[PDB]
C-alpha cells in the first residue's frame, strides 16, 4: 500500500491533514521491501513540502522505519545526508540526526558509513541550536572512531548545560564501547565538577570516576602545592567533596562511585571517616544525611571499601554500631548486612557487643534475622561477652520463640568458632553441681537445646574437655544427634 501512501499524501492536502495521515501510517509495521519503497516515496515527498512540522514528522518516520528488523539500511544513507545537506529547520535537523544515529547503530560492522556519519556529526556540531549539537554529540558517542575525544573535550565547555551533559555522556559512551580515554579529560571534568547544574555535576563525577579507574597510578601535581598526588587519590578527594553536594541524587551517585575506588591509598581512607584535604569527613557526612538513599549508598560504599581495605573495617565498625539505630528499617538492614560482611577478622569489644545485643531485642523479625546472621559471622574475645551474648539470645528466645532455628544456628556458629572461650563457661551453663547429682533437664525445652548446641559445637573442635558432661548430657547429645543432626556435630 505504498502507492496508496503516495496518492494520499500528494492528493488530499498539503499543510495539515498530511501530518494526520503520516501519524496514522506511523502506527503500523512495514515489510522490508515495502520499507524501501515507502522510504523512497517519503524522501521524494520531503522536498515538496515546505511546512517544517510535516518534514519533522517525515524525519521521525524515517527514523522509525530505519529501526525495522529485516530492512538493511545501507541503501538509504546517501539520500539521508543529501536531505541534511539543505535542511534549515533545527528541529527537523535534530530529528534527522536521530535518524542517522539509528542508521549507524543498526550497522556497527561497516566502518566506512560510520566514518561518514561522524564526519556529518563533526560538520553539524557548529549549529547554533542546542538540540542539533546534542544529537551530533550523541552521534559521535555512539559511533566515534574506535580526533573525537579532542572535539568532545572542546564541547565540554559549551554555554548550554544540556550540551555539556551530552558531551560528557557521549565520551562516557565512548569509554563504555571500548575506547581508552586521554588524561586531559581529568582536568576538564575537574573544572566542570563545580557546574551550576545538577546533571552536569552528576555526569562530571561519573567521568571523573571513569578516568580515575583508567589511570589510577598516574601522578598529577597539586595546583597550589609542590607535592604530587596519585590520580586515584585526587579523584577520590573530588568525589568525596561531591558527597557534600546540594542535590541528593548527586550525593547518591558520589557515594556509589566512591565505593568502587578500591585503589585509593590508605591515608585518605582513614581521612574519610575522621571528624576533625577535601576527603575529610565525607562518609561521616554521608551517614547522617537526611535522605535515606544517601545513607544506604554510603553504607554500601563503606562495605566495598572495608572489603578492599582490612584496616578500614575497624574505623567502619563504630559508625555501623551507631547507625544500627536508624530511623529507616532498610538502612539498618543494610548496616547489619554490611557489618556481617566486614566482620571477617576484627574482634568486638564490650560496648559494641552489648549495643548489638541491645538491638537484638527489636520487634522486627527481619532485622532480628539479619542480626542473627551477624552473630553467626562475628568474632569476639572476652568470654564473659560470649556469656552475655548467650543470655541475650536466650531472652530473645523467650521473648520470640519463633526464631528458635535461627538462634540455634547462632549458637552453633558461636560454639564452632569460639571453642576455647566457651570451655570455662560450661559449668555455669549446664547446672553441674560439683558433688550433687543434678536433675535431668527437660528435653524439647528450646532454651536447653540452645545451651547444648552452643556447648556441643564448642566440644567438636576442642576434645580437651568433653568429660565435663554428665550422663544425661550424653543421653541428650545422642538425642540431638538423632534429631538436630544438621546443627550438633559428631
Amino acid at each position: 500500500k505504498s502507492a496508496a501512501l503516495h496518492i494520499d499524501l500528494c492528493k488530499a492536502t498539503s499543510p495539515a491533514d498530511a501530518l494526520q495521515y503520516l501519524l496514522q501510517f506511523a502506527r503500523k509495521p512495514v515489510e522490508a521491501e515495502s520499507v524501501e519503497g515507502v522510504v523512497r516515496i517519503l524522501l521524494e515527498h520531503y522536498y515538496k513540502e515546505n511546512d517544517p512540522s510535516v518534514r519533522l514528522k517525515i524525519a521521525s518516520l524515517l527514523g522509525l522505519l530505519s529501526k525495522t528488523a529485516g530492512f538493511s539500511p545501507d541503501c538509504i544513507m546517501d539520500d539521508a545526508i543529501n536531505i541534511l545537506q539543505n535542511e534549515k529547520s533545527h528541529q527537523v535537523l535534530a530529528q534527522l540526526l536521530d535518524t542517522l544515529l539509528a542508521i549507524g547503530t543498526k550497522l556497527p560492522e561497516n566502518q566506512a558509513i560510520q566514518m561518514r556519519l561522524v564526519d556529518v556529526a563533526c560538520k553539524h556540531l557548529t549549529d547554533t541550536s542546542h538540540g542539533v549539537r546534542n544529537k551530533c554529540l550523541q552521534l559521535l558517542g555512539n559511533l566515534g572512531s574506535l580526533d573525537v575525544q579532542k572535539i568532545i573535550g572542546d564541547y565540554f565547555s559549551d554555554q548550554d548545560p544540556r550540551v555539556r551533559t551530552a558531551a560528557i555522556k557521549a565520551m562516557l559512551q565512548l569509554h563504555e564501547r571500548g575506547l581508552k580515554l586521554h588524561q586531559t579529560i581529568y582536568n576538564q571534568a575537574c573544572k566542570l565538577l563545580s557546574d551550576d547544574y545538577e546533571q552536569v555535576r552528576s555526569a562530571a563525577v561519573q567521568l571523573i570516576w571513569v578516568v580515575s579507574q583508567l589511570y589510577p597510578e598516574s601522578i598529577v601535581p597539586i595546583p597550589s602545592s609542590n607535592e604530587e598526588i596519585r590520580l586515584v587519590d585526587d579523584a577520590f578527594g573530588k568525589i568525596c567533596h561531591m558527597v557534600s553536594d546540594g542535590s541528593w541524587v548527586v550525593r547518591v551517585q558520589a557515594a556509589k562511585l566512591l565505593g568502587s575506588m578500591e585503589q585509593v591509598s590508605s591515608h585518605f581512607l582513614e581521612q574519610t571517616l575522621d571528624k576533625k584535604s577535601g576527603a575529610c569527613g565525607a562518609f561521616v557526612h554521608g551517614l547522617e544525611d537526611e535522605m535515606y538513599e544517601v545513607r544506604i549508598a554510603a553504607v554500601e560504599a563503606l562495605c566495598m571499601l572495608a572489603q578492599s581495605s582490612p584496616s578500614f573495617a575497624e574505623k567502619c565498625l563504630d559508625f555501623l554500631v551507631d547507625m544500627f539505630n536508624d530511623e529507616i528499617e532498610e538502612v539498618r538492614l543494610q548496616s547489619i548486612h554490611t557489618m556481617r560482611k566486614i566482620s571477617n577478622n576484627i574482634t568486638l569489644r564490650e560496648d559494641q557487643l552489648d549495643t548489638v545485643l541491645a538491638v537484638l531485642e527489636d520487634s522486627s523479625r527481619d532485622i532480628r534475622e539479619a542480626l542473627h546472621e551477624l552473630l553467626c559471622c562475628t568474632n569476639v574475645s572476652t568470654k564473659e561477652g560470649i556469656h552475655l551474648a548467650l543470655v541475650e539470645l536466650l531472652k530473645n528466645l523467650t521473648k520470640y520463640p519463633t526464631d528458635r532455628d535461627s538462634i540455634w544456628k547462632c549458637l552453633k556458629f558461636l560454639g564452632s568458632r569460639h571453642p576455647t572461650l566457651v570451655l570455662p563457661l560450661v559449668p555455669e551453663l549446664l547446672s553441674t553441681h560439683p558433688f550433687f547429682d543434678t536433675a535431668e533437664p527437660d528435653m524439647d525445652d528450646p532454651a536447653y537445646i540452645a545451651v547444648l548446641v552452643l556447648i556441643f559445637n564448642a566440644a567438636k573442635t576442642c576434645p580437651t574437655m568433653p568429660a565435663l558432661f554428665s550422663d544425661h548430657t550424653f543421653r541428650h547429645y545422642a538425642y540431638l544427634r538423632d534429631s538436630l543432626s544438621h546443627l550438633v556435630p559428631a
Binding site: 501530518l19 501519524l23 512540522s53 521521525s60 536521530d98 548550554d160 544540556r162 551550576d196 547544574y197
Partner: protein
C-alpha cells in the same frame, strides 16, 4: 513560538510548547472517557454482566456484548493516551503539571517514550494524584480481566460499529492501565514546587506555578523568557472553594494565554447542584432507600461532605451512616487535613487555632462518616441498610461502585447521584441500563464558566489567546447559545488533537547584562534620547549573555 497539541480533550490537555530553546509540556491528560465503551469491571462475577448477549456483525461476537441496545467491548477498560508521536518526547525538557486530574498518563510519557527530562508539580497535586493513580491501578488489578478484544480496533470494522463505538477516536492508541512500578518511577522524577516559586530552566525560561483555585495544590503556570511571557491557565475556579484563590494579577501582560479546563456543562450553578444533591440525598434516605455517590476520593467530595455536614443536623439525618469506601480513602482524608497551607484564608485560619482545617474530620470522631479501604474487610460488618456510600470510580467501569450498582439497581428506592462532570451520565449508566434505580445528575463543576473567563480575559488582556476548538464553538448539547463560547477582540486561536500551532508572537530584544567596566567606557553622546557606540566581546554562559571590554 510553536505549540503542539497532543490531546483533543478540553479539560484533560497535553500541550507541548516549543518556546525559544526549551521544550515545555503543559500537563498530560489521560482521557478516561474511552473506558465508557468497555464493559464494567466488577468485584465479583455478576450473573447479569456475564451472560449478556453478544453483538454480531455480518463480515467478534466474543469481543462485543450488547446491553439494552448499546454495544460494549468485553475487555479491560483501555485509556486514551495523549498522542505521543507528533513530537519526539525525548526532545521535551520539562513537564509542567497543573492538576492531579491532569497528572494522569504521566507514567505513559515518563516511561514508554524515552522522556529523560524533569517534572514540576506542587506538593498536593503530586500526593493526591499518587493516591488517585494508586486506586486506579488497584481497581484495574483487583479482579484482573484480560485484554482479549482486539479485532474491533480496526479501520474496516469500526466503521460498521454502532454510534457509541464508531465515534471513538484514536482507538489504536488506547492502552492498558499502567502498573504500580511505573507509577513509582513516574512520581520519583517529579521536582516539587510551591506557589509563586521561580524555576529557572537552563537559564533561558522561567516558570512559576500560580494558584488556580480549582483543587488544593492546583496551579496555573506562566512561562517567562526575558521580555515575553506565556500564560497557561488550566482548570481554575473563581468561586469560594477550599484552596487558595486564583492568582489573576500575575497573568497580566502576557503575549499568549493558553487556556484549558473550562466548565463542562456550563449551564449549571454549582451551589444549586449542591442543594439538589443534598435534597435528593435527604429524600432518598428518608424513604428508606440508599444513596450511591460515585466520586473521586478527593476534590468535590470535600465540598459535598462539608455541605452534608451542615445539612444532616438540619435535616435530622444523624441516624443515616455515611460510608466512604476507597483504597486511598484514609490517605485522602489525612492529606486533606495536612495541606492547610494550600487552602484559602478561611480554612488556614482554622489551623492557627488547634483545629482541623476541614470539617469532615469531625465526622470521623462523631462517627457520622466511616471510611473503609474496601467492601470486604470490615464494611461488611458495619453496614446499615439506609445509608449513603461515596465510592468507586465515577466512570462506573471499575471500583466498588460497580458492585454497589449491581447490588442496588433492582430497587426503585435506591438512588445514584452524580456529582462529577468528567464522564457522560448516559454512557455511564448504559451498561447497567435495565435498572429500577433513580439516577440524579447534578454535576458540581466549579471551574471557570464563560462569563467568568470573559471577565478574566477583560481583566488580563492577553495579546493572543489559544484555546481548544470546542471553546470557540457552542457546545453540541446547545449548539445555539452564543454566550457559551470564548469571544475576544482577537478571534482566538483554536486547536484540535495532533495539530501544530505557530505563534507569531516571537520578538527581538533578548536581555543582556553589561558589567560596569564597559559602562564607564561608553560615552553617552547627546542625540535627543542618547546614543553610544560600543565595542565589546560577547560572553554567553548558561543561556545568559554578558558584554566584556576587549
Amino acid at each position: 513560538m510553536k505549540l503542539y497539541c497532543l490531546s483533543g480533550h478540553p479539560t484533560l490537555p497535553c500541550n507541548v510548547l516549543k518556546f525559544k530553546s526549551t521544550t515545555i509540556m503543559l500537563d498530560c491528560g489521560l482521557d478516561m472517557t474511552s473506558t465508557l465503551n468497555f464493559l464494567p469491571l466488577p468485584l465479583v462475577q455478576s450473573p447479569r454482566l456475564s451472560n449478556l448477549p453478544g453483538w454480531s456483525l455480518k463480515d467478534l461476537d466474543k469481543e462485543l456484548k450488547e446491553c439494552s441496545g448499546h454495544v460494549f467491548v468485553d475487555s479491560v477498560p483501555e485509556f486514551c493516551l495523549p498522542e505521543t508521536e507528533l513530537i519526539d518526547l525525548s526532545t521535551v525538557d520539562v513537564i509542567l503539571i497543573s492538576n492531579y486530574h491532569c497528572m494522569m498518563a504521566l507514567p505513559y510519557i515518563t516511561e514508554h517514550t524515552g522522556f529523560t527530562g524533569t517534572v514540576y508539580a506542587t506538593e498536593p497535586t503530586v500526593q493526591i494524584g499518587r493516591l488517585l493513580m494508586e486506586e486506579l491501578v488497584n481497581f484495574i488489578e483487583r479482579v484482573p480481566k484480560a485484554q482479549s478484544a482486539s479485532l474491533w480496533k480496526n479501520k474496516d470494522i469500526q466503521r460498521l460499529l454502532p454510534s457509541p463505538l464508531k465515534d471513538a477516536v484514536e482507538v489504536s492508541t488506547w492502552r492498558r492501565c499502567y502498573t504500580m512500578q511505573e507509577v513509582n518511577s513516574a512520581l520519583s522524577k517529579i521536582q516539587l514546587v510551591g506557589y509563586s516559586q521561580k524555576i529557572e530552566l537552563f537559564g533561558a525560561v522561567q516558570v512559576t506555578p500560580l494558584s488556580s483555585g480549582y483543587a488544593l495544590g492546583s496551579s496555573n503556570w506562566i512561562i517567562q523568557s526575558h521580555y515575553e511571557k506565556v500564560s497557561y491557565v488550566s482548570g481554575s475556579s473563581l468561586l469560594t472553594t477550599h484552596p487558595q484563590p486564583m492568582d489573576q494579577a500575575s497573568l497580566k501582560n502576557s503575549d499568549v494565554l493558553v487556556l484549558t479546563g473550562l466548565t463542562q456543562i456550563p449551564t449549571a450553578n454549582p451551589d444549586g447542584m449542591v442543594g439538589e444533591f443534598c435534597s435528593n440525598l435527604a429524600l432518598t434516605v428518608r424513604n428508606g432507600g440508599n444513596v450511591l455517590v460515585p466520586c473521586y476520593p478527593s476534590g468535590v467530595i470535600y465540598d459535598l461532605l462539608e455541605c452534608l455536614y451542615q445539612y444532616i443536623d438540619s435535616a435530622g439525618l444523624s441516624s443515616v451512616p455515611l460510608y466512604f469506601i476507597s483504597p486511598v480513602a484514609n490517605s485522602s482524608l489525612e492529606f486533606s487535613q495536612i495541606f492547610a497551607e494550600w487552602l484559602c484564608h478561611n480554612k488556614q485560619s482554622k489551623v492557627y487555632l488547634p483545629e482541623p482545617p476541614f470539617p469532615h474530620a469531625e465526622l470521623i470522631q462523631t462517627n457520622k462518616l466511616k471510611h473503609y479501604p474496601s467492601i470486604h474487610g470490615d464494611f461488611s460488618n458495619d453496614f446499615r441498610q439506609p445509608c449513603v456510600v461515596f465510592t468507586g470510580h465515577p466512570s462506573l467501569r471499575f471500583g466498588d461502585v460497580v458492585h454497589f450498582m449491581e447490588l442496588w439497581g433492582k430497587s426503585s428506592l435506591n438512588t445514584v447521584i452524580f456529582t462529577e462532570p468528567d464522564f457522560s451520565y448516559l454512557e455511564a449508566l448504559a451498561p447497567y441500563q435495565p435498572l429500577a434505580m433513580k439516577c440524579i445528575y447534578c454535576p458540581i463543576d466549579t471551574r471557570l464558566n464563560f462569563i467568568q473567563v470573559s471577565k478574566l480575559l477583560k481583566e488580563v488582556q492577553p495579546l493572543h489567546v489559544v484555546c481548544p476548538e470546542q471553546y470557540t464553538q457552542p457546545p453540541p448539547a446547545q449548539s445555539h447559545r452564543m454566550d457559551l463560547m470564548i469571544d475576544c477582540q482577537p478571534p482566538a486561536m483554536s486547536y484540535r488533537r495532533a495539530e501544530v500551532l505557530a505563534l507569531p508572537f516571537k520578538r527581538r530584544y533578548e536581555k543582556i547584562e553589561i558589567m560596569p567596566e564597559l559602562a564607564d567606557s561608553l560615552v553617552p553622546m547627546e542625540i535627543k534620547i542618547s546614543l553610544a557606540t560600543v565595542s565589546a566581546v560577547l560572553h554567553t554562559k548558561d543561556n545568559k549573555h554578558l558584554l566584556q571590554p576587549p
